[PDB]
């Protein structure tokens, strides 16, 4: 009768439900785009060496299922992005070693299927036989878990062109078969849908499917025949060993990050510790005037932690916009409840992003990325890694890296807001570089919007732009009047605008910021 429920929705007006699932974790999140960011990671599934915008609803699948800590050193990035997602989306770039090969299934003139595997980046070519081929690009090895394809026929079009349907399904380790999608397509060189949609085979495939691409021989498409096939599963494709990571892959991913035509104001170490990659990202931060979130090896005790800052090579007056992080403790897994260790870089990013995002007009760039509102790690069962080792305060201060202390309710606060700026100048803080970066942005977009304008008005537009941006800063409270009235005056800001020739306008602005209070003094005494 009509009471029995089928497995999955087909073409009927009805309800079909899946079997109840326990091992499936799904979380709620709506991004607000407060700080665009990206990072270099090595994951399962997804196109490697390419920027992918990951939201609070796709990291489960497009980024792939999270691996475990024992599977090499690749749980650090998945955990990092896990805490990162709860604030805003990312532009992550995935990297795979040379061992990664994707699978390809070649169908001959009569539809005869054959299997092959090719390394990523390598091109695809077809011999005299094997009329065409289809390859998966989702990054899934199709073996853990597994996915299958089904080919059937259907009715023809108005022109009488043959039409065949392809269905995709996924199968788990247990063997539960769940369909994903189905699409009909016609082999005709000029195949069109009854909506007018393009039914040309590779074109239709790329238009509908986000998982499969195809290559078709122009000399064999005319003679290509179709057949009814069932359970078409890719074989021979796998990512290989993801533990082994190459500096070549690192630099290629860095190049991808650079060439990415999207805005991103923050970058992460995200479990990367290669010195060359760290230096490359530091140069990227320097030459793009952005903020970097490098992290060091957590296993380094304070004895060798101090030389690691010099070993970074980013020490200097140029690489001051970046920050370096460490986490000398052990926590408990949320998922597998295991004694694990991973950096706090993403947690710190999320903390500062939340602390800045509450402010409306421009964001509290000047806010200290700490406090109960921000400085909350609280993963699970935090334990020290090296209780034997002991840090030194003055050595740590001259090392300019961020340590961590106890908080209000026993939780564990980042007790530092100091960058790796070697020189002890007022820009060696974190709020100061934040304000240079913010003002750099605003200046850029105002200049770009007023770019290529008839003369006689540019100076005026600059004047009012300065006034309004100072208005936003004084509303935010970041900039205040100078503390020295007699010699330094009482004006929180000053402007200079002029021009040299038909081109080369010039503006010089000075501003006075406010305090942050990252050290405090207190002295007790008694009247007895």
């Amino acid at each position: 009768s009509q009471y029995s429920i089928q497995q999955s929705l087909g073409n009927a007006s009805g309800v079909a439900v899946s079997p109840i699932n326990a091992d499936a974790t799904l979380s709620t999140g709506v991004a607000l785009n407060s700080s665009l960011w990206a990072g270099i990671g090595v994951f399962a599934r997804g196109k490697p060496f390419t920027v992918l915008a990951v939201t609070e609803s796709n990291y489960e699948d497009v980024l792939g299922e999270p691996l475990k800590p024992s599977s090499g050193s690749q749980f650090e990035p998945i955990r990092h992005v896990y805490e990162a997602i709860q604030q805003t989306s990312g532009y992550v770039v995935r990297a795979v070693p040379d061992d990664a090969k994707f699978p390809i299934i070649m169908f001959d003139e009569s539809g005869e299927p054959a299997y092959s595997a090719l390394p990523y980046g390598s091109e695809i070519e077809l011999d005299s036989g094997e009329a065409f081929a289809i390859y998966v690009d989702d990054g899934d090895p199709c073996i853990s878990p597994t996915r299958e394809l089904t080919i059937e026929t259907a009715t023809a079009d108005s022109a009488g062109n043959e039409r065949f349907l392809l269905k995709l399904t996924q199968t788990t380790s247990l063997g539960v078969v769940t369909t994903l999608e189905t699409h009909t397509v016609s082999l005709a060189e000029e195949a069109k849908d009854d909506m007018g949609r393009l039914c040309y085979l590779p074109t239709a495939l790329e238009a509908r499917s986000k998982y499969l691409r195809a290559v078709v021989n122009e000399e064999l498409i005319s003679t290509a025949k179709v057949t009814n096939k069932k359970s078409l599963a890719f074989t021979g494709g796998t990512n290989g060993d993801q533990s082994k990571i190459s500096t070549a892959a690192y630099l290629r991913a860095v190049k991808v990050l650079n060439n990415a035509p999207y805005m991103y104001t923050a970058v992460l170490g995200l479990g990367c510790y290669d010195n060359a990659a760290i230096t490359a990202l530091g140069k990227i931060c320097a030459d793009r005037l952005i903020d970097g979130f490098f992290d060091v090896k957590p296993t380094l005790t304070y004895a060798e932690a101090l030389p690691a800052v010099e070993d970074t090579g980013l020490l200097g007056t140029d690489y001051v916009s970046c920050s370096v992080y460490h986490y000398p403790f052990s926590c408990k897994d949320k998922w597998t409840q295991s004694r694990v260790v991973f950096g706090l870089s993403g947690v710190a990013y999320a903390a500062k992003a939340r602390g800045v995002k509450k402010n409306s007009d421009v964001g509290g760039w000047h806010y200290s990325p700490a406090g109960e509102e921000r400085a909350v790690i609280a993963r699970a069962s935090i334990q020290p890694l090296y209780p034997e080792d002991t840090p030194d305060e003055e050595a740590m201060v001259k090392g300019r890296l961020n340590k961590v202390s106890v908080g209000t309710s026993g939780q564990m606060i980042i007790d530092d807001a100091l960058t790796c700026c070697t020189q002890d100048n007022y820009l060696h803080f974190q709020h100061v570089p934040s304000l240079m970066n913010a003002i750099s942005r605003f200046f850029v977009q105002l200049a770009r919007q007023m770019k290529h304008s008839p003369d006689g008005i540019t100076a005026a537009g600059l004047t009012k732009g300065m006034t309004k941006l100072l208005d936003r800063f004084v509303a935010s409270g970041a900039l205040v009047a100078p503390r020295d009235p007699d010699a330094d005056g009482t004006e929180p800001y000053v402007l200079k605008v002029t021009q040299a020739e038909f081109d080369k306008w010039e503006v010089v602005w000075a501003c006075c910021p406010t305090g942050v209070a990252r050290r405090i003094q207190g002295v007790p005494l008694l009247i007895k």
């Binding site: 409306s360 007009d361 006034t467 208005d471 936003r472 004084v474 509303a475 009482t490 004006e491 929180p492």
Partner: protein
């Protein structure tokens, strides 16, 4: 420009033009009523008040909150050509109380009133959902002297309860009836 009061006013005006909205985005609606969002003209809402007691202690009294004294909703509405609003009210009060006098089940005559906030794109988001029942429209006046405005009236609805704001769908095999 650089004076303290000029800075203050500038901050105030910027944050005002950036964070202020008029009473523009709003929508009142009731299950089973079509066009009621249009016909209704005014709303007055009170969820509940909470009462305190005084206690005498030395030179001071201490007041402590006890209990949520409930409120009500009152909606000022104009009707249509056919008096569909009066028709709906008649039906509602009929379901609330039997004209034969017996007490109806307090589940069939309960209506889910909801006010949402609109968006710039016309979308709505929940703002307040109450489960209420009609009580009285009040002493209303009708005459011919209303020569520049239409005869309109308010309706007062009392919430079912300030506790367990629950509801279900009658459209089922197991209806709002129960097993004794």
């Amino acid at each position: 420009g650089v004076g303290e009061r000029e800075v203050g006013k500038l901050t105030s005006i910027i944050m005002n033009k950036m964070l202020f909205a008029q009473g523009w985005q709003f929508s009142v609606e009731v299950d089973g009523l079509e066009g009621a969002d249009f016909f209704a003209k005014d709303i007055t809402y009170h969820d509940y008040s909470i009462e305190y007691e005084t206690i005498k202690i030395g030179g001071g009294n201490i007041l402590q909150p006890t209990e949520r004294s409930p409120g009500q909703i009152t909606m000022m509405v104009r009707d249509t050509v056919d008096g569909l609003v009066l028709d709906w009210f008649k039906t509602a009060k009929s379901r609330v109380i039997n004209p034969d006098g017996t007490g109806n089940i307090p589940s069939q005559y309960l209506l889910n009133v909801r006010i949402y906030r609109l968006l710039s794109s016309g979308l709505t988001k929940l703002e307040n959902e109450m489960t209420v029942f009609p009580v009285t429209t009040g002493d209303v006046t009708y005459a011919r002297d209303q020569v520049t405005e239409f005869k309109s009236f308010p309706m007062t609805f009392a919430l079912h309860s300030t506790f367990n704001q629950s509801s279900s769908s009658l459209a089922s095999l197991l209806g709002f009836s129960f097993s004794l």
